[PDB]
Each structure stands twice: as structure tokens, then as C-alpha cells.
């Protein structure tokens, strides 16, 4: 029973801002979610209470799953503050999650400023 629908501002993080995160060379941890068991981290389900990343969000904004740009938003700051709270600061990861970041901040600037819904047919 989640509403859900496409708005300018949804359309612009999905056509413009994944578009650019998902192809950087950075992207490749974020496109999935983190396989603890894989990557071998200890209490990672304890300390991250609430798993994000890119390929959740991708299928989202394909799925039309949203209502609005600012739950989209929530879901990039929740994948970027959990890899800040589990990882050691000075961790490659992290760099990696901070370069996407600014990539992030920076393309939302260009976003269009109202938020207004789209027909979908």
C-alpha cells in the first residue's frame, strides 16, 4: 500500500544523477547490496540497521516506487552515512562513497526546483 508515482524532480534523480553514479568507477560496491557474510564483516546487521544501495534505488525509480524526490534522497543518504558509520574513516570504501557523494550534491544542484507529477500513460 506504498503510493507511489514519477515527478520531475524523481525523473531527474533517475535520467540525470543515477545515470552519472551508476557508470563511475566508483559505483561497483554500491550496486548491490553489502554482502556481509561475503566481505567478512563482523556486526555489520547490528550496526547497520537499515542496508541501502544503488541497485535498490535504480529498481525503485524504475518501479516507480517513490511519491516523492525527498524519500529517493533519503534512500542515497542512507547507503552514504551507512558506509560512514561502519567503516573506519581513512578505508578505500569510504573515499569511494564520498567521491559519489559530491558527484551526487553536485547533479542535484541542477535539479529542477518544484516538484511536479508527470503523466504516466
Same mark, same amino acid.
Given at each position: 500500500m506504498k503510493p507511489g508515482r514519477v515527478t520531475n524532480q524523481l525523473?531527474?534523480?533517475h535520467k540525470v544523477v543515477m545515470k552519472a553514479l551508476w557508470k563511475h568507477q566508483?559505483?561497483?560496491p554500491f550496486r548491490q547490496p553489502v554482502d556481509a557474510v561475503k566481505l567478512g564483516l563482523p556486526d555489520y546487521? %547490528?550496526?547497520?540497521?537499515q542496508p541501502m544501495?544503488?541497485?535498490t534505488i535504480k529498481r525503485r525509480l524504475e518501479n516507480n516506487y517513490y511519491w516523492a524526490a525527498s524519500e529517493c534522497m533519503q534512500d542515497f543518504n542512507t547507503m552514504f552515512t551507512n558506509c560512514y558509520i561502519?567503516? %573506519?574513516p581513512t578505508d578505500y570504501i569510504v573515499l569511494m562513497a564520498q567521491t559519489l557523494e559530491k558527484i551526487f550534491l553536485q547533479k542535484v544542484a541542477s535539479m529542477p526546483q518544484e516538484e511536479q507529477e508527470l503523466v504516466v500513460t
Open positions: 525523473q531527474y534523480l566508483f559505483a561497483w546487521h %547490528k550496526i547497520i540497521k544501495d544503488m541497485g561502519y567503516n %573506519k
